[PDB]
Curated annotation (Swiss-Prot):
Domain CBM2, chain residue ranges per copy: 1-87
Function recorded in the entry: Endo-acting xylanase which displays no detectable activity against polysaccharides other than xylan. Hydrolyzes glucosidic bonds with retention of anomeric configuration.
Natural source organism: Cellulomonas fimi
Similarity-based family: Belongs to the glycosyl hydrolase 11 (cellulase G) family.
Name listed for the protein in its UniProt record: Bifunctional xylanase/deacetylase
Length: 87
């Protein structure tokens, strides 16, 4: 009982990068995304993620263990942090 979410860099440009976190081990998992600096969430897919501060609750739609969102670099091309928990 322990989801294993992972992070990775998919697309990228002089404005933001499409991060692609891959979850494997369980379907009912939750990956709390945490942008860095003033970064923000421009878009997402493969999972219902939302929020309004420095983190967004991500969730699997049923078969999209791996999600992907546009990290608004906003002066930061570093990948965000993501953690998961069994619940």
């Amino acid at each position: 009982t322990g989801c294993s979410v992972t992070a990775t860099r998919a697309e990228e440009w002089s404005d933001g990068f499409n991060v692609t976190y891959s979850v494997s081990g369980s379907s009912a998992w939750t990956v709390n995304l945490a942008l860095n600096g003033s970064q923000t969430i421009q878009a997402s897919w493969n999972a219902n993620v939302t929020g309004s501060g420095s983190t967004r609750t991500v969730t699997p739609n049923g078969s999209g263990n791996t999600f992907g969102v546009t990290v608004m670099k906003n002066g930061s091309s570093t990948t965000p942090a993501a953690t998961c928990a069994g619940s």
